[PDB]
Amino acid sequence: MLKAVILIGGPQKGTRFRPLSFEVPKPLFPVAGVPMIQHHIEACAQVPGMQEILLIGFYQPDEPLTQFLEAAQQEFNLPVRYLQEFAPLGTGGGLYHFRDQILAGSPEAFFVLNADVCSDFPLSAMLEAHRRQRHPFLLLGTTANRTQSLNYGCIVENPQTHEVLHYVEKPSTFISDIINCGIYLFSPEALKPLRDVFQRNQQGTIRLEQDVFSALAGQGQIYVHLTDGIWSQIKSAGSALYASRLYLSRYQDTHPERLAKHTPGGPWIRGNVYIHPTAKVAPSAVLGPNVSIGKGVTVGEGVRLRESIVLHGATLQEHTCVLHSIVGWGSTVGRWARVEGTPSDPNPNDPRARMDSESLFKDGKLLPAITILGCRVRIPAEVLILNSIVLPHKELSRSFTNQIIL
Amino acid sequence: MLKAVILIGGPQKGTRFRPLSFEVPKPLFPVAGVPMIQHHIEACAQVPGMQEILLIGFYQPDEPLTQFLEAAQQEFNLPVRYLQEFAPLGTGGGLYHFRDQILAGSPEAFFVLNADVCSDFPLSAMLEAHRRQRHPFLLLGTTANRTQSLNYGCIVENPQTHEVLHYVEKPSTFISDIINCGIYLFSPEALKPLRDVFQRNQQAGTIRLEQDVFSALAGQGQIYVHLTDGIWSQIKSAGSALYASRLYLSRYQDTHPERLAKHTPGGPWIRGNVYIHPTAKVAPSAVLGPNVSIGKGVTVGEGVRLRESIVLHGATLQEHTCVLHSIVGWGSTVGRWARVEGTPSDPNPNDPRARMDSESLFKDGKLLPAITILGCRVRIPAEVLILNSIVLPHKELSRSFTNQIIL
Amino acid sequence: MKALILVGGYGTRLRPLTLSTPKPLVDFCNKPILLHQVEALAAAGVDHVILAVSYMSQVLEKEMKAQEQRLGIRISMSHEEEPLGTAGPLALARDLLSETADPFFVLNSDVICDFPFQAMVQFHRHHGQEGSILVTKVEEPSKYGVVVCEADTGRIHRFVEKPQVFVSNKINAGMYILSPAVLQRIQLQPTSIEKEVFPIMAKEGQLYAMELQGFWMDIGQPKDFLTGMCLFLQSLRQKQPERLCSGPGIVGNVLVDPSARIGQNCSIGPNVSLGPGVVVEDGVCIRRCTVLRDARIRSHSWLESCIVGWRCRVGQWVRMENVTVLGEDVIVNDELYLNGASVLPHKSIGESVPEPRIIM
C-alpha cells in the first residue's frame, strides 16, 4: 500500500492568486469545473493500493475546506485527511513534522504533490520506475525551452542511470532543459535526510528544493523520471485559465462526459467546453474553445464566451462578449458589455512566454494579461473591461482599460 | 441649541483615488494622529450651545465605528450617534430621511460637514454671519486656482450681500474661482426645499445636495456664502491625507501644543512638526522629519529616518530603515535597511493658492508615481526598496518592488 | 569700490563646456562671463575687484593678470585650496574687504544682466543698512531665492531660498551691495550666504531690495545659456544695433566675430552668436546656436539650439537640435542626427543620437 501527500499552501501562498483567493482558498479554485486539488485526488485514488490522502497546509479549516474534504472522502472511496501545520514550515518541513502520520501503517512509498501544479499525474509509471529501482527520491521532470527553463528548478541528470547530478532552484544562467514538476515519490528512507536537515537547522522550516534536492544531488539518492504529458504551474490568478485549458483538453481521454457536445437545439459549442448541469445556457450563446461554466450560471442569448472561466452564480446578460477572462462568483455582466483579456500562458515550451513574475507592471503600464473579475462585480451595460483586474464587490459605471480597479 | 451632522460616506462611495487603507473605514483614518472625523468633532464640540453630533452614512456598524463613537462620547461629553441609511441616499437624501432625528429638540441651526475635508472649521464665524443674516443655506467657500476650480463646486456670488447667484457642481469650463468648502450652516427651514426635491422625484429618496438644492436654488435669495482664508483641503487620495496631515500638524502649533513632539535630547531627533503617540516606542537614534505622525504601539528602531509619513498603529520599523512619503499600514513590518519611498503630490509652488490635485491612480493607462501604501500586516524584508507601490494587506514581500500594485 | 565675485568651481550645471575651460572663462556672446562683469565694474567706478577662485586657477589667473593691465584695475584674487561655497570667501577676505569703511559689490559669476551699479549703490546709501540686493521678477520662483518687498522702499520682510508654498514672486538677481559690518559676523566655516546670513538680516530690517529694469538670466544650464544669449542679442538690438552683423543672407540678430567667416547659400538664423576664429562652410542653417572659438561646421548641416565648443568639427549633412552641447574638440562624422546629445570632450561620434543622452 501507498499514500499521497498533497502539499496545499496557506493564505500567504495564495497572495499571488489574490483576486480569486479573496473568496475561496487557492487549492479549492475550480479549474475546468472541479477544484484544483480534486485533480490530484482523482489521479491518486486511480492508483491501486492508495490507502490515505493527506493534505498538509497551514490553512485554517473553514467551511469550504472541510466540506470539500467530506465530499472528496465520499466521492473517492478513501480517507482524505487534512494535517494543519502549526506554522508555515516550508515544503519539506511539513513532511518531516508529520512523518509519524505519513508513515503510520508503513506505506511502501508515498507521493508528494504540490497543489499548484496541473499535470496528467503519471503516478503509475512513476511507481513502475520506483519498484524497478527503489531509490529514496524520484522526481518528475519535464523538458522545457532553454529560455523558459530559467523560471523553473533545473535538473542536470545522467541520461543512463537517470540520477540527478545537479539541482538549481532558479538559475540566472542556463543549466538544463529538464525542469522539476513538483511531483515526487519518496520511500520512507527519504525522511532520514530531512531529519539531518532539521538537525542542521538547530545550530523547523525545511525548503525541499533548496536544502534536500540541491544538497544530495549527485550522491546517489535523487533520481528523475521524465515525461512530456501536460504540465503547468498555477501561481497567479490567470494561470488558472491555462491549467483549465490543458485539463479540458485531457478530458477527451479521462472524462469525455464532462465535455459538452453541440446538440443542434442547444448552445453552439466550439472546442472543449465544460458546462455544469445547473447552468442555463441560451441556444444562441456560442461557447468557444476552452470555456468552463460553473453551477448556477445564467448565460443569456447571443453571449460569446471564449477561453474563459465563469464561476458559480455568475450572470452574463444578452449579447456579451467575454474573452480570456475569469468571471468571479456572482458577477453580473450587463448587456452588450465586453470583458476582454489577453492570452498569457506559463507554457515552459513557449519561447515567448513571460516569467510569471509577481510584478504585474513594467513601468507604470499593466502588462496585458487575463482580465480577472472578483466576486460580486457588477459590470454595467454597454461597457468594456479590457486587460483589467477588478477587485471584489465593485459596481462599475465606466469603461476600464489596462487598470487594476481597487 | 445647535447640532451637527457629519456626512460620512459608505463602503463603495469612498472610491479611494489612491487608497489610504483597505480595512478601516475612511472616516476613521488617522490624519495627524487622530481619526479624520475627530477634527470635526473637536471643532463642533468647541461651539457653545452645540448639543448633539450625528454621523450619517451607510457603513454597517462594525466594531471600530462603535468604539470610536464611544470614545468620542466619552472625550467630548456629547452624544455622538450614527444614523445609518438603508441605501446610499446621496448628500441630501440622508438629511431628508433623518429629519425627525435631526430636528428633534428643535435646534437653532445645524452644521452639515463633509467627512473628507481638512478645515480650520470657523464654525463660530459662520454662526455669527448666520445669526446676523438668518438664511436657509449658508456655505463656507474658499478661493481656488483658475485651473483647479473645475474640480469643486463653483459659486458666482454677489459681493455686496454675499448671496450665491450661480452654482455649478463640477464644471467643464471656468465659471468662478470661489469653491464650496463642504461646510454648511442650515436653518431648520432648509429641510423644506429638500422635501420639494423629493416630491419632484415621487411624481428611494436620493437627493444630491449640491446638484439639486444648491444648483437650482441659487439666485433665489436662499443660499449665501461665507468666505474664509484658513486651511482647507479635500481628503480623497493618500497624498491628500498626507497633505491634510501637514496642514493639521501646522494648525496644532496654536491649538494643541501638547500634541507635537519636542526634541528632548535624550530622545529622538525631531525636525518640523511631528506627532508621536505617547505609547509609541521611538529609539533615540531615529530622526523623525517634518510631517510625521506615529500611531499607538509603533516600534521605531535605531537610525530610522521618517519623513512625511503616517505610521499607523502596531507597525514596527526595524533599524536603519528610511520611510519617506508613505503610509505604513497597521501591523506592518519593515525590516533592516529597507527603504519604503513614495513620490510627493505637491501643489504647484509657482502659483498662488493652488490647493491640491488628487491623483486618480492611473493617468492614461499608466500607473502614477505617488505615495507608497503598505496595507495592514504587510511584511517588508530586510534590505529591500519599495518605490511608489501599493502593497495589498497581509502580504509578505521578498524582493524590491518599484512602481507596482502588489496584490 | 571693492567688488567680490564668488567664481564657482567644477561648473556641474553646464558641464561639457566646463570640463575644459572654467565657467568664468567660457565666452558668452564672444567674451567670457567674468569679462562682462568686470568691464561693467570698470565702468561702474570700482577701484579694484577681487574674485574668489577655487578651481582651475591656472588659466583663470593667467587671464586675470593679462587683463589687469587692460582694464586698468587690479584684478585681485582669493585663492582657496578647498571650496568654501557661497559665504566662506566672505570670511576669508575679511581683512581685504575690511580695510575701507565703504560698501562692496558681491556678484554671482554666472548672472548676465544690464547692470545698474550706480542705481544699486546710490539706492544703497539712501537707507544705509547692512545689505541692499538686486531683485527681478520671474515666472517660476521655486528655483531661486525669493523675497518679500514692501511698497516704495523695499525692505526684505522674509527671505527663503526655495519658497515651496509660494510666498512671493520676486527673486535674487545675484548682485548685492554689502556693508563692512556684515563681514566679521560670519565665520570661515563654509555655509550658504542665502540660508543663514540673509535670513537673519531680514529679521532686523537691514536687507533691502532694488527692483531691476529687466533682462536678467543666470546661465547655469545650457538651456539658460541659450535663453540668455537670446536676451543679450535682444539688448544689443535695442541699444547698439551696429554690433550685430546683418547682411543679405542673415536672418534675425546675429553677433559674429570679425575673424569668423561664413559661406554662401547659408542661413544664419535668429539669435545666433559666432565666436572668434570659426569657419562656417556653405549651405548650413544655424539658428539659436552658439559656436565657440575656432570651431568648424562643414557643408549642408542644420544646427538649431545647440552649443558647439572649441575646435569642434561638425561634419556634413549633420542635424543637431534640442540643446545638444558639444564639449571641446568633438568630431561629428558625416550625416548624423544628434537630438539632445551632451558630448564629452575629445570624443568622435559615429552613430546617430535619437534621444537626449550623455555621450562618453
Ligand SMILES: Nc1nc2c(ncn2[C@@H]2O[C@H](COP(=O)(O)OP(=O)(O)O[C@H]3O[C@H](CO)[C@@H](O)[C@H](O)[C@@H]3O)[C@@H](O)[C@H]2O)c(=O)[nH]1
Ligand atoms: N450619507 C451619505 N453621505 C455621502 C454619500 N455620498 C457621499 N457622502 C459623503 O458626503 C460628502 C460629499 O462627498 P461627494 O459627494 O463624494 O462629493 P465631493 O467631491 O466631496 O464634493 C463636495 O464637497 C466638495 C468639498 O470637498 C465641494 O467642492 C463640492 O461642492 C461638493 O460639496 C463626502 O464626505 C462623502 O463621503 C451618500 O450617498 N450618503
Ligand SMILES: Nc1nc2c(ncn2[C@@H]2O[C@H](COP(=O)(O)OP(=O)(O)OP(=O)(O)O)[C@@H](O)[C@H]2O)c(=O)[nH]1
Ligand atoms: N504544506 C505546505 N505547503 C507548502 C508550503 N510552502 C509551499 N508549499 C507548497 O509547495 C509549493 C512550493 O511553493 P514555493 O514555497 O513558492 O516554492 P518553489 O515552488 O520551489 O519556488 P520559490 O518561491 O522560488 O522557492 C507551493 O506551491 C505549495 O503548493 C508550506 O509552508 N506548507
Ligand SMILES: Nc1nc2c(ncn2[C@@H]2O[C@H](COP(=O)(O)OP(=O)(O)OP(=O)(O)O)[C@@H](O)[C@H]2O)c(=O)[nH]1
Ligand atoms: N570662489 C568660489 N565661488 C563659489 C564656490 N562655490 C560656489 N561659488 C559661487 O556660488 C554661487 C552659486 O553657485 P552656482 O549658482 O550653483 O554655480 P556654480 O558654483 O558654478 O555651481 P554649479 O552650477 O551648481 O555646478 C555662484 O556665484 C558661484 O560662482 C567656490 O567654491 N569658490
